[PDB]
Design a protein around this ligand. Sequence first.
Ligand SMILES: Cc1nc2ccccc2nc1-c1cc2nc(N3CC[C@@H](F)C3)cc(N(C)C3CCOCC3)n2n1
Ligand SMILES: [Mg+2]
Ligand SMILES: [Zn+2]
Length: 312
Amino acid sequence: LMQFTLPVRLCKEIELFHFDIGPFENMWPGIFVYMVHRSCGTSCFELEKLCRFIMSVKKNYRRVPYHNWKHAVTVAHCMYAILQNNHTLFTDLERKGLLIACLCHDLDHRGFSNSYLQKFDHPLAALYSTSTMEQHHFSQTVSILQLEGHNIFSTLSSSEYEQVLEIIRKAIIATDLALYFGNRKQLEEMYQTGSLNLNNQSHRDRVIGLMMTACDLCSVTKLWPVTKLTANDIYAEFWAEGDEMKKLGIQPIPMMDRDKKDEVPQGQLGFYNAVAIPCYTTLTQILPPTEPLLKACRDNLSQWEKVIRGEE
Ligand SMILES: Cc1nc2ccccc2nc1-c1cc2nc(N3CC[C@@H](F)C3)cc(N(C)C3CCOCC3)n2n1
Ligand SMILES: [Mg+2]
Ligand SMILES: [Zn+2]
């Protein structure tokens, strides 16, 4: 049968946590299939259904600056690297579920936070009172899975199918950064008091949640030019949201105000110290081979410090 392959530089570098999927959009589907085949197997999905699923997922991402198809694939590659470095800790269903979850986790994102949907009074905020966009992303995932010839899970049993959709729902809900803080605090305590148990389903759930945050934030773990240029796409969205907050007569948070451009370097420090570093720290304690993500994050924090000190 038909192994997907990649050019040599990509074949080698795709295995590393810091890999950038590149600017050639038409190669991103092949990169994902390559990752499913190596992390899951050539037998995991019917190639034809998988190809049709990927192309419908792509079409349901919007041309926004950051929360786009390139983010989806980027977040899947970080998951792939985690799974390939922790081969024997994950069930076959988890391998299957989590790459699809990462590809789908921001489906039909519009470039706005949960908070802006609530203040605009968007219909999605009446349908889903918390984790508004994330419940929408899971709903879009199930919609696409139910299109004719798109059910990539059709060969599982009733209960394996319910389990995989449950892995995907939880993984996608965990990408709500509002739930990250409390999830990591709990994982921290469970690990330090030695009560963390990967046979306890509700513990595994928490560990997958943290893996989803880690993959979602993985732009902070890249080569500095990738990090810094991705930061520009993130702020293009934040600042548009700020603009839309001012049109509703609401002063945006500093993060989203384009008048406070000059503070970006310091806001990045806040984010690395409050979110990213503690995320990759706890992840590294639970899964030692993910340590390269913590080290790259620490390297990028020190590049932001250099931007403040005027050395870059
Ligand atoms: C939320 C995010 N997500 C990323 C994901 C990937 C890559 C970079 C990412 N950066 C950010 C990000 C950007 C940013 N800019 C800030 N300021 C304040 C005014 C001006 F100086 C820029 C302040 C913050 N906070 C301190 C956040 C602390 C954690 O909860 C949300 C608030 N953040 N966080
Ligand atoms: Mg999201
Ligand atoms: Zn995301």
